[PDB]
Design a protein around this ligand. Structure first.
Ligand SMILES: CN[C@@H]1[C@@H](O)[C@@H](O[C@@H]2[C@@H](O)[C@H](O[C@H]3O[C@H]([C@@H](C)O)[C@@H](O)[C@H](O)[C@H]3N)[C@@H](N)C[C@H]2N)OC[C@]1(C)O
Ligand SMILES: CN[C@@H]1[C@@H](O)[C@@H](O[C@@H]2[C@@H](O)[C@H](O[C@H]3O[C@H]([C@@H](C)O)[C@@H](O)[C@H](O)[C@H]3N)[C@@H](N)C[C@H]2N)OC[C@]1(C)O
Ligand SMILES: CN[C@@H]1[C@@H](O)[C@@H](O[C@@H]2[C@@H](O)[C@H](O[C@H]3O[C@H]([C@@H](C)O)[C@@H](O)[C@H](O)[C@H]3N)[C@@H](N)C[C@H]2N)OC[C@]1(C)O
Ligand SMILES: CN[C@@H]1[C@@H](O)[C@@H](O[C@@H]2[C@@H](O)[C@H](O[C@H]3O[C@H]([C@@H](C)O)[C@@H](O)[C@H](O)[C@H]3N)[C@@H](N)C[C@H]2N)OC[C@]1(C)O
Ligand SMILES: CN[C@@H]1[C@@H](O)[C@@H](O[C@@H]2[C@@H](O)[C@H](O[C@H]3O[C@H]([C@@H](C)O)[C@@H](O)[C@H](O)[C@H]3N)[C@@H](N)C[C@H]2N)OC[C@]1(C)O
Ligand SMILES: CN[C@@H]1[C@@H](O)[C@@H](O[C@@H]2[C@@H](O)[C@H](O[C@H]3O[C@H]([C@@H](C)O)[C@@H](O)[C@H](O)[C@H]3N)[C@@H](N)C[C@H]2N)OC[C@]1(C)O
Ligand SMILES: [NH3+]CCC[NH2+]CCCC[NH2+]CCC[NH3+]
Lengths: 148, 125, 195, 260
RNA sequence: GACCUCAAAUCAGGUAGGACUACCCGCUGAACUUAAGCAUAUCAAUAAGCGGAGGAAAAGAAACCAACAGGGAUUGCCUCAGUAGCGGCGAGUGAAGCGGCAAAAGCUCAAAUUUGAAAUCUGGCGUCUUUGGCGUCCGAGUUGUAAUUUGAAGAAGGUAUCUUUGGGCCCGGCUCUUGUCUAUGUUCCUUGGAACAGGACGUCACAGAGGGUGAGAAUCCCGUGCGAUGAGAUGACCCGGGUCUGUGUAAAGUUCCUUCGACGAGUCGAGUUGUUUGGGAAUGCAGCUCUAAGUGGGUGGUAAAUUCCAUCUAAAGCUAAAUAUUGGCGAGAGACCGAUAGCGAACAAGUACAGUGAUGGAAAGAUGAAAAGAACUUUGAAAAGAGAGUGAAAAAGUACGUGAAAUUGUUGAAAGGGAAGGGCUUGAGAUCAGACUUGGUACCGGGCCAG
RNA sequence: GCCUAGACCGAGGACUGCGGUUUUUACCUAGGAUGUUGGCAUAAUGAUCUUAAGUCGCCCGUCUUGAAACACGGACCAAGGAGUCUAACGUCUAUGCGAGUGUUUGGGUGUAAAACCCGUACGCGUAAUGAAAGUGAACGAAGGUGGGGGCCCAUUAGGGUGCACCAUCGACCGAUCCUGAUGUGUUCGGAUGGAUUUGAGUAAGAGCAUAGCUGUUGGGACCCGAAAGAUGGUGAACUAUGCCUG
RNA sequence: GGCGAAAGACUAAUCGAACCAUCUAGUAGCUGGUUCCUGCCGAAGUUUCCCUCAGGAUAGCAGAAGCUCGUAUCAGUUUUAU
RNA sequence: UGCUGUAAAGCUGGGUCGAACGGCCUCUAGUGCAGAUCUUGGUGGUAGUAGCAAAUAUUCAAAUGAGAACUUUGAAGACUGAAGUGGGGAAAGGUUCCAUGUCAACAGCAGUUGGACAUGGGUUAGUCGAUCCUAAGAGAUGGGGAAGCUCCGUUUCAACGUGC
RNA sequence: AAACUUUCAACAACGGAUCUCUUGGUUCUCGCAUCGAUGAAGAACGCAGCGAAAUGCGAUACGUAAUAUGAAUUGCAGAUAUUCGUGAAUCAUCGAAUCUUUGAACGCACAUUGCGCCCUCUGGUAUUCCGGAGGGCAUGCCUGUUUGAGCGUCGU
């Protein structure tokens, strides 16, 4: 609200906080990103390195849907098991009856290998998997099943 | 409280509709309550005031005066009673304008139309 | 005009933008009016449902394959499986799409099942129908009554079967095979015919 | 304001050398308007400084959970008699709060009957407070459809409306509300806690379903009532308790004696 | 005597133009400005100019999007996304597919021998039950008017014998306009010119919104709220029923078999030029040159040849809704402005007035409840004054609500040798203030200034 | 050590302390003034206004190294008169929920632009890195060393445990350089081990949303101010020149 | 654009490019102004870069908000040694 | 008239006046002026001041009238001096014309007077003009351009008489 | 010492601030689709018992008809105007009319109240000349009718 602004406090003081010498003017230094290579180089080269120039190749008509592949790590994998049956599955899963985790159905494209799994066999269904993620799943007696 | 979306609570709209009202609308706007005697006689609570009606003034400095209406001065939103005058210093006398809501009708001027109006309103005559 | 450490902004306000400002002050009014329009439209044709029955289709785009949604209309082959002519289906509240095709079997079966459920719940009136029967039906909401259902993710328990080749290696080999498919066949063609 | 207000002239500055300020001036002649200044916010008949626009922000988003928090806090305040009195309600003849009334109040249809119920339950003094509070508004608001001001009366909350809403419309200051839709503007008017609330028994029983408890889920999806950051709000008793008083040192004087 | 082409008529009957501006479809088209200069760029495919509409317009039933397990006319919102990209790669700029919703609606021709029958249509005349029907005569039309088909198909021959039936009229409903009808104090006291104020006792309330009336009126008036009851229109293109004809060898629909299956050209496409686009060895548009084909043609966002694949089906046409709306018409509102504000204009305001002209363009709201707008006498040439009078008030007199300041007159007090004003301090003159307390029972006791 | 002359001040408000005289749980000059007397209350006493005297006092505002300036604006008075709103952002703070978070495009509902209710998607966050194809975060109590509040055991000193944060040596993921096993569409694959390299990374999540002040950019952009440039119109009643008729 | 026995003359008191409305609140590193009180803290005219020299950015100087701790190790100073 | 606050300001006595308004907790903004050759309106000093001096020039008496340097009449003295200060017209104005009444404003003194103000009256055509003709020139039309507003063409690439 | 000047107070001025309102403005929302050759929008000039404007109207002129309604209008005047009624006032409603001179503007022309032609009736001894009344005569284009043109062309 306007009653909290310093405009109210500057009433009665000549320059409104803008100085007597500098004399707040319209656009000293230009408009927008003017002079980024000339008189604003000392700002851009310090706080925005990399600003000027071209790097890499162009990609005409990029469709972002081609690259949809959300990641899930191993340490978060068991959140996808039904919460009502998570405690039962941990104690009862074995090589004959292991939980099936459909990562794609939950919105994920690749399983990554960060963290530690429960020492419980799991059947993990995924479009993609990292090398370490599959080794850790196979080490707790589980398996990775590729889907499409 | 009002509910209809066809009804306006605007003060300016109400005042403009009041002051620009036609003569015909002013006739209804200038209604007077019946006395208790005529209310029991005709079973009607209020009627638009008319020329040969007779009234009792119940408000103002002329409260308690009785007379017969000489003219419903619809342009001035007022009625003129027969002998309720104001004598000027030069001897000439002028009527005293009274709003119909400040009187009670004591005797109705009746014809076919007043009788039909009274019957419409659920009254008897 | 460039100053202290701050993100570089892209505010596109260099045209006469104030001549083209649209403030939706009528959001609530349009909501109420759109609601009255639905009310009158339903009252006009009761007890026939307002909404035509719509099919269930997969969504395109590897990002949206997992999802299923309502499509435009049932295909000519799907209606043919239930025995309904395309021109007749439009008069009994069934949407028709001549553009969609049925390459696979799963969606075809799902929509044939939808058509059979709808046709089993359908009651057509005629001249022999008395107003007592007509008044006995309420205006059903077809979209809610026949909703689109996501096929469930696989859950529960199953035996663990471990192939000798890892899934990561399978992905790597599939990529390599695709990448060099064109040049390995060219090396093959130029070699078999010469030898 | 109008987009072109103060800008419907063809005025141009006279320039310098004519012994007048450089503000634009109306051209032509033969009228008193000719030669007068224009366009400037300091000029009579110019446009105002920074003219008001319709695309100002008028509505404000509030997180839905925090709004529900505020609703619950307002309902809890209505059972504290000190807050209801400080709120300004004439509730001194009501034995206990919450004030719960039998469900026959829901089936009252006449205003006379509803006022009789309000008198019987001891709520009519607050209604009389509303009646004797009516005043003409101070300032120009009376020119804009806000001619009169009055206090707020009780809020009556029901579960079924079998005529109670219409029986109570005409009574000045009284507000009705379904227990299903309770809001802050009715529960804490002026942002002041402690509304006088009359519950019918049905509404008072529905409260536990509407907002949930430790044994009942709220009908509100995924909603639970908030937890306080303190469990015992009676801090003086905590301080003056055996557990605390058994580890403190003896207290010094309330005021140090002046020594020099 | 026909036909073709071309004329004329105050020939019979029609039609067009012009206006309006907010939104809509196109053409044409800047510069200021930003880039701290400036030319490409930006402003902007904007303003100005020109043509053309409607209640919406436009678009629209894929020569689409995609690359998936595929979606499926058009339009809009949210998102995609300040992203891919474009850009003296600088300043800047900048979409689309998917996804969630609003709304949903589909279709028509050309290309076919009716050929055992131009089956079609305008007009004249007559007639009637007249947005038209019937009869009849000219004319149009074979250089092609009807029926039949539109790619989702479909046609021509067989089929299982299966499924359905058109229109003209009368009363209703619904929809629209519109008439009539409605609760409760003007009870008592006080103030006031006036009660609508305050106090007392009440009443109605599905009505305590708003306005009027001599001051803040739920209950005085109009209304408000709640319903009740009539009248008249209008709807191929809304449905609830009757009704006479149902010419039902007529029309149409479905399944299966066989042979077929016409599908738009100076167009597509290519080159070049200009412009434009996010479209980058070229996105759309346009000019000129070249100029096709029939499983052909287009598209598949990097130019080219070779081989595949996918997906549609151009060069012809119609179509509600969701969308827009500083105009027109009818309404309801606001944490808006309150007469130097708010539209320029609250008023005989686009007025008075100015300019040859295009154009430019003000100022200006309020006596009082009621004119009761001051009879009469007197001084004066008169304007006026003084008496009187009306009024609650003339400290309201149509120079009229209140009536500030600058500035001015009179009266009273004071001061004054080439400015005046100011601070500090005290004197003098004036004004204000307090403890004899809310004092205690002649005494007790207290306040102030001082030794 | 003693005697003696003046001035200014009296803050505080039961007691509590340190000392002193000891005659004594007493008294004092020792943690800030009391006693007594007169006068007055129709009044001395105080405050303000005007004025006289003494002393000091240049005209404000502004630009400026420097203004009373022979620098600029200001004859006087009233009323109006200038950092705003919005889009997108940085820091900080408050609040709700928290590995999530955001109801308000829309739908439901309504005492109807309110309040109340609902969920699919989507946004941002939960993973980075590389131009890209692509790959993608535990040797170990999520490591070692030196500090570290608090807690624990003790008993001053001492020992233990040590979150946040800091310095330091490592480890993990992506890019870069090297090495190059078993195998093969024999040119692919890339085990394994190295490198004063490199990243806006990991190493028991911290974010999302609303609001506020301040700061930033685009906008008329704190207010008033050009000389100019463009588009579309109106003028030869003055005047310049030709023509026609007097 | 006109018109000019030519002065850049004249083209309605307007001419080294008329008048009128609009674009347009055109842009200004430049001049002027910028409205209440008290309290606390309190500068700079210097560095580097810039068609930079009446202007900016950058560092410095200043305020605000704090946060982690509680005598650790600091100083516009001396002494001793070097 | 006093009181409170360092202050921004707040409260109060008396007078005027006539219809609404305030304290407290919060919300919100088109929220505070001495300046901007600021804007609009109003008002001063200057100041009863500069000034009201071109165009030869006025005077006596009577009438009227409240009032006469300025009106009317009479008597004089003058001037324009026919290239007029005379008698008419064109352009332009528009009732200013005439009679009667009238003096608040206007006639930079005055006013009984007036082109002022008010109320009425007044402009008569076969022959005077317009109207008709053509002049420089303007401009429709079959048409040819131009996206078009429109441009070009008039001895106009035309089947052109509303013939005698 | 007066006068004069200056300060203050009182009353009176000047002037129009302040305060209080408000048939206006401004903004938002909701609903609706209806200009014109059947002559629009706009312009000029007129019209009332007594009117300059504004408002309305068009020689039927502050209006005619019709429907509704039910006693006024009002500043003054006034009826051969009205009251238990075909009846006061009424842009109340509105479906029938009137609608000057114009204007896209239409016989031609227009700085003119200028100039024709056709039909019917009518006055002046009149088919011609002069007068009056009513009704007509624009352009582009379409369909049709009628009258035609061309060795363009068929046949006889
Ligand atoms: C929608 N606006 C209407 C407004 O037009 C007008 O309506 C009158 C209404 O008051 C009249 O009705 C009135 O007058 C009649 C009678 C004396 O005429 C009385 O009997 C009746 O009680 C009274 N309400 C009715 N007869 C005609 C409507 N147009 O009055 C106000 C209103 C009802 O709001
Ligand atoms: C008598 N002269 C007329 C007259 O009508 C005049 O009226 C003013 C009138 O407007 C004033 O009244 C005023 O009232 C308030 C207040 C400031 O007074 C004003 O804001 C408002 O504009 C105005 N109505 C009134 N006090 C005096 C009359 N002479 O206004 C125009 C005029 C020509 O000067
Ligand atoms: C422990 N030291 C390692 C150092 O050895 C090196 O590891 C390489 C690693 O870069 C190679 O891996 C590389 O190449 C493989 C590709 C061949 O499949 C890629 O998938 C991978 O992304 C890429 N980093 C790996 N194949 C061998 C290791 N020794 O990586 C850097 C390091 C962390 O310093
Ligand atoms: C391959 N040689 C490695 C050498 O490169 C280095 O490893 C660095 C390591 O120090 C970096 O790590 C460095 O920077 C990271 C930061 C970037 O996240 C810090 O977290 C970390 O504390 C810091 N040491 C790491 N980012 C990359 C390794 N190759 O460590 C030494 C070494 C083994 O010789
Ligand atoms: C308790 N275990 C810790 C583990 O939590 C983690 O600690 C990090 C620490 O390494 C980070 O610190 C690291 O990265 C920072 C960074 C600024 O570059 C540097 O100081 C440096 O590279 C390195 N010490 C520190 N910033 C946060 C701790 N939680 O790192 C591993 C560890 C030290 O074992
Ligand atoms: C090639 N076609 C031509 C066509 O162009 C035209 O020719 C005209 C001719 O008619 C014109 O000539 C015509 O028009 C002119 C007029 C223009 O002044 C007349 O003066 C002249 O008499 C007349 N014959 C001639 N001046 C130009 C040709 N192209 O007419 C003749 C034609 C053979 O048909
Ligand atoms: N609105 C701008 C109109 C002028 N067009 C200029 C932009 C055209 C883009 N050119 C980019 C380079 C070509 N691909």
């Amino acid at each position: 609200p306007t009653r909290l602004t310093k405009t109210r406090k500057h009433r009665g003081n000549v320059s409104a906080g803008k100085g007597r010498i500098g004399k707040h003017r319209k656009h000293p230094g230009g408009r927008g990103k003017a002079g980024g290579q000339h008189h604003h180089r000392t700002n851009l080269d310090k706080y925005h390195p990399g600003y000027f120039g071209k790097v890499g190749m162009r990609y005409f008509h990029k469709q972002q849907n081609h690259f949809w592949r959300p990641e899930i790590n191993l340490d978060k994998l068991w959140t996808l098991v039904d919460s009502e049956k998570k405690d039962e599955y941990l104690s009862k899963s074995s090589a004959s009856a292991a939980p099936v985790i459909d990562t794609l159905a939950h919105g994920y494209g690749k399983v990554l290998g960060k963290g530690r799994l429960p020492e419980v066999p799991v059947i993990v269904k995924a479009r993609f998997v990292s090398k370490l993620a599959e080794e850790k799943i196979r080490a707790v007696g589980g398996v990775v099943e590729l889907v499409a | 409280a009002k509910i209809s979306q066809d009804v306006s609570s605007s003060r300016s709209k109400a005042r403009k509709a009041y002051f620009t009202a036609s003569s015909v609308e002013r006739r209804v706007l200038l209604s007077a309550p019946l006395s208790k005697e005529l209310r029991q006689q005709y079973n009607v609570k209020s009627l638009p005031i008319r020329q040969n009606d007779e009234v009792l003034v119940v408000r103002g400095s002329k409260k308690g005066s009785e007379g017969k209406v000489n003219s419903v001065y619809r342009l001035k939103f007022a009625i003129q009673v027969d002998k309720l005058q104001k004598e000027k210093s030069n001897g000439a006398s002028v009527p005293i304008n009274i709003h119909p809501s400040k009187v009670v009708i004591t005797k109705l001027h009746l014809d076919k139309d007043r009788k039909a109006l009274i019957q419409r309103k659920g009254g008897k005559a | 005009a460039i100053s202290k450490n701050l993100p570089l902004l892209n505010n596109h306000f260099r045209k006469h933008w104030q001549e083209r400002v649209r403030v939706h002050f009528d959001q609530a009014g349009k909501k109420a009016s759109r609601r009255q329009s639905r009310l009158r439209k339903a009252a006009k044709i009761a007890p026939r449902p307002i909404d035509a029955l719509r099919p269930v289709v997969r969504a395109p785009t590897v990002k949206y394959n997992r999802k299923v949604r309502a499509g435009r209309g049932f295909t000519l082959a799907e209606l043919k499986a239930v025995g309904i002519a395309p021109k007749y289906a439009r008069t009994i509240g069934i949407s028709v799409d001549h553009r969609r095709q049925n390459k696979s079997q799963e969606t075809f079966d799902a929509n044939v099942a939808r058509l059979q459920e709808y046709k089993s719940k359908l009651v057509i009136f005629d001249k022999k129908t008395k107003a007592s029967e007509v008044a006995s039906f309420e205006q059903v909401d077809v979209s809610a009554t026949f909703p689109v259902e996501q096929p469930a993710p696989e859950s529960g328990l199953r035996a663990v079967e471990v192939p000798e080749q890892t899934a990561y290696r399978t992905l790597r080999l599939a990529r390599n095979e695709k990448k060099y498919k064109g040049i390995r066949e060219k090396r093959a063609k130029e070699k078999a015919e010469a030898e | 304001v109008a987009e072109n207000a103060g800008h419907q002239t063809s005025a141009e500055s006279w320039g310098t050398g004519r012994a007048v300020a450089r503000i634009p001036r109306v051209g032509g002649g033969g009228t008193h308007r000719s030669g007068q200044a224009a366009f400037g916010n300091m000029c009579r008949g110019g446009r105002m400084f920074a003219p008001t626009k319709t695309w100002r922000r008028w509505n404000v988003k509030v997180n839905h959970n925090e709004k529900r928090y505020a609703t619950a806090s307002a309902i809890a305040a209505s059972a504290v008699t000190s807050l209801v009195l400080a709120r300004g309600h004439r509730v001194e003849q009501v034995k206990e709060l919450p004030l719960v009334v039998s469900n026959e109040f829901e089936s009252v249809t006449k205003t006379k009957d509803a006022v009789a119920v309000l008198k019987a339950v001891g709520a009519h003094k607050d209604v009389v407070k509303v009646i004797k509070s009516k005043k003409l508004r101070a300032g120009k608001g009376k020119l804009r459809g806000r001619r009169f001001t009055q206090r707020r009366g009780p809020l009556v909350v029901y579960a079924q409306d079998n005529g109670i809403v219409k029986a109570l419309r005409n009574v000045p200051g009284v507000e009705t509300a379904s227990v299903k839709h309770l809001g802050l503007l009715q529960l804490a008017p002026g942002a002041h806690l402690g509304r006088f609330i009359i519950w019918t028994q049905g509404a008072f029983e529905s409260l536990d379903s509407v907002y949930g408890s430790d044994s009942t889920k709220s009908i509100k999806s995924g909603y639970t009532l908030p937890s306080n950051i303190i469990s015992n709000t009676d801090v003086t008793r905590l301080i003056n308790s055996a557990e605390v008083q058994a580890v403190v040192r003896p207290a010094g004087e309330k005021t140090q004696k002046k020594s020099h």
